[PDB]
Amino acid sequence: MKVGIDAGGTLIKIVQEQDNQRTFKTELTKNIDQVVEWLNQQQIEKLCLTGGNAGVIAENINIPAQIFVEFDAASQGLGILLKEQGHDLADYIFANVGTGTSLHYFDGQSQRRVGGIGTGGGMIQGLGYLLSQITDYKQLTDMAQHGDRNTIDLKVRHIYKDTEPPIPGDLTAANFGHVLHHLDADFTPSNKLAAVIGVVGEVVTTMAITVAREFKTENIVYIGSSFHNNALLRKVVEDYTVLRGCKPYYVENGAFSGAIGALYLE
Amino acid sequence: MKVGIDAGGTLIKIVQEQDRTFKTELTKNIDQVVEWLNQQQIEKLCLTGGNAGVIAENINIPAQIFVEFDAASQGLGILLKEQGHDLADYIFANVGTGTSLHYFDGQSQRRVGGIGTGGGMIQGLGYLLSQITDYKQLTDMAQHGDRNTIDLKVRHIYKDTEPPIPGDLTAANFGHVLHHLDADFTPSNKLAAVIGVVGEVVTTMAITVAREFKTENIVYIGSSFHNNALLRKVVEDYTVLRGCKPYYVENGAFSGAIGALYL
Ligand SMILES: Nc1ncnc2c1ncn2[C@@H]1O[C@H](COP(=O)(O)OP(=O)(O)O)[C@@H](O)[C@H]1O
Ligand SMILES: Nc1ncnc2c1ncn2[C@@H]1O[C@H](COP(=O)(O)OP(=O)(O)O)[C@@H](O)[C@H]1O
Ligand SMILES: COCCCCCNC(=O)CCNC(=O)[C@H](O)C(C)(C)C
Ligand SMILES: COCCCCCNC(=O)CCNC(=O)[C@H](O)C(C)(C)C
Numbered sequence: 001m002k003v004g005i006d007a008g009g010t011l012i013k014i015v016q017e018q019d020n021q022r023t024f025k026t027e028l029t030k031n032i033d034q035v036v037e038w039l040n041q042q043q044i045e046k047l048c049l050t051g052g053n054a055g056v057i058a059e060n061i062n063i064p065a066q067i068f069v070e071f072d073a074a075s076q077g078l079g080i081l082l083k084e085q086g087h088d089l090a091d092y093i094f095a096n097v098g099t100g101t102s103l104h105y106f107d108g109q110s111q112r113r114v115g116g117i118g119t120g121g122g123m124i125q126g127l128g129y130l131l132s133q134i135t136d137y138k139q140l141t142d143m144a145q146h147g148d149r150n151t152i153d154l155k156v157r158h159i160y161k162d163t164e165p166p167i168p169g170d171l172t173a174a175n176f177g178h179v180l181h182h183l184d185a186d187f188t189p190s191n192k193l194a195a196v197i198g199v200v201g202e203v204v205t206t207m208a209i210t211v212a213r214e215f216k217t218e219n220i221v222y223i224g225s226s227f228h229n230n231a232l233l234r235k236v237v238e239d240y241t242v243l244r245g246c247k248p249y250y251v252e253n254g255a256f257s258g259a260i261g262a263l264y265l266e
Numbered sequence: 267m268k269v270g271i272d273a274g275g276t277l278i279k280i281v282q283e284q285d286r287t288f289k290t291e292l293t294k295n296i297d298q299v300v301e302w303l304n305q306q307q308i309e310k311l312c313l314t315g316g317n318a319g320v321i322a323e324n325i326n327i328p329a330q331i332f333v334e335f336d337a338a339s340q341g342l343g344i345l346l347k348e349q350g351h352d353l354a355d356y357i358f359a360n361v362g363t364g365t366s367l368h369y370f371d372g373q374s375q376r377r378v379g380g381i382g383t384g385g386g387m388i389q390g391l392g393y394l395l396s397q398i399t400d401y402k403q404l405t406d407m408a409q410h411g412d413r414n415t416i417d418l419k420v421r422h423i424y425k426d427t428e429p430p431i432p433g434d435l436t437a438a439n440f441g442h443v444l445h446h447l448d449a450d451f452t453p454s455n456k457l458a459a460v461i462g463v464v465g466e467v468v469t470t471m472a473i474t475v476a477r478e479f480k481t482e483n484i485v486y487i488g489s490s491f492h493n494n495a496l497l498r499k500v501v502e503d504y505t506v507l508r509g510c511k512p513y514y515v516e517n518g519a520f521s522g523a524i525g526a527l528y529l
Binding site: 056069099116120121122123125126129154163165171176178183206207213214 | 274316319320333334335364377379380381382385389391394399416424426427435436437439441443444447451456463474477
């Protein structure tokens with residue numbers, strides 16, 4: 001058994017490999033203690049680590065472990081999964097949408113971090129909590145799928161009324177920009193949660209299409225756990241990427257890219 | 267008397283020249299602006315922005331209408347020169363109800379992006395997190411707010427481990443909320459975090475296109491800065507951290523109204 005772990009701020013991603021049979025496992029970072037305990041019981045041929053909490057794991061385990069930088073690990077695991085799933089992309093931006101978001105340009109051989117932003121999954125949970133008092137992730141994200149953004153968000157055509165706008169009128173002009181025109185409306189947790197995701201989705205995508213243009217690629221690969229159980233977040237990201245003339249790609253087990261990469265390095 | 271008006275989604279910016287007067291009125295009160303205009307003797311009336319059409323239809327005199335991007339660019343160059351800046355090139359980030367970003371190459375401008383994180387989000391999300399609707403009050407309240415229990419930093423995730431980017435960077439806006447559920451989230455802290463996120467998104471976008479178009483100059487404008495020192499500081503600090511020069515402009519929010527006049 002060989003093992004790769006991407007110990008992030010919110011989720012611990014574990015890949016076990018055994019005779020080319022692969023296991024994909026998630027555990028909360030909150031429960032890192034139980035991950036360490038599990039590890040100490042196992043017969044492990046090779047253990048590779050990455051992410052911010054790799055150190056916490058490495059210190060509390062009884063066996064050696066190689067530790068890799070998460071940007072390189074994610075890039076390598078993602079290329080392994082892109083190949084396996086029939087994509088041969090000469091180059092691409094990838095947007096690792098986790099607790100926060102890191103953006104990368106892969107030129108065909110290697111990656112470079114070209115930006116990042118703190119709009120990501122951690123904001124969906126945290127701001128989500130402030131607007132709804134829901135702490136359970138599944139519940140939070142389910143509820144948001146049932147949401148309407150029209151009373152909350154302001155569109156380019158809302159500002160330009162009956163004039164020809166100088167950019168497409170369906171574009172979001174101001175996230176939460178309509179709230180003050182609907183104070184005679186009672187803002188439901190679904191609507192509000194849909195608008196949190198709405199803004200997170202549009203910020204990530206905008207950043208991604210911008211660096212796609214800068215590094216002269218049309219391919220944008222979206223990964224990270226922020227997409228699990230959140231179809232609304234995919235749709236927002238997908239629709240807008242397309243609107244901007246770029247190809248969006250999701251990846252089966254994209255959130256484990258870092259755990260896989262750690263396995264297939266050095 | 268000549269008049270330029272930038273009728274935005276939230277604020278109507280009026281410049282009167284009689285030779286300069288700078289006046290603001292709420293877009294909600296556009297009716298009173300139209301009434302004021304119909305009483306006046308105006309040699310030339312130039313209009314720009316989204317609500318220009320609403321004004322133009324309800325007035326009882328002619329009016330040239332310009333596209334806001336070209337107007338803002340022209341007015342801003344006038345103000346830059348007047349205030350002693352000779353910038354060969356620059357990004358400008360018009361931070362209004364929403365945010366539009368531009369690259370000025372020394373002779374003309376081009377829109378290189380935009381985002382819906384801006385002043386409208388400060389007000390709107392601000393309202394949702396505090397039930398304050400008054401802008402002055404909302405922004406005053408945010409000013410000494412503390413973000414540390416709300417935002418998550420690179421070093422919080424890389425707890426005792428060398429991070430691969432600077433550890434003081436915000437990693438996740440609102441990303442700490444779930445680690446402080448025992449804590450009272452006060453309206454100031456929460457409002458400081460709204461502005462925090464809006465400031466960091468605008469700046470990130472602006473420094474990114476600054477790099478792309480190989481300029482180190484970033485000029486920030488729009489009314490979103492008025493009575494919000496915290497929003498300037500967040501934007502300013504991070505721009506500097508990224509190796510770019512931030513610039514604010516006296517009456518930068520009127521750039522569009524001025525530009526309409528001189529086109
Ligand atoms: N089971 C879950 N519990 C909490 N968050 C989840 C879960 N599944 C998906 N998420 C979302 O994914 C995010 C974590 O993404 P991930 O890419 O694993 O980031 P990190 O590597 O920083 O832990 C969370 O902030 C949340 O939005
Ligand atoms: N007196 C005010 N009333 C309402 N909003 C204000 C005021 N002063 C500043 N603001 C802020 O300015 C933003 C509008 O910026 P502005 O550049 O005037 O854009 P627009 O052209 O879309 O009206 C508002 O969204 C709000 O954040
Ligand atoms: C003081 O903060 C200035 C604003 C910084 C905002 C930009 N922040 C970032 O680029 C970090 C975003 N987050 C990430 O990249 C990821 O969550 C990691 C795990 C930190 C890599
Ligand atoms: C359907 O949603 C599209 C995703 C949001 C895309 C980006 N939004 C924008 O570029 C609009 C930002 N707003 C602005 O530039 C200004 O407020 C104007 C006045 C509308 C020009």
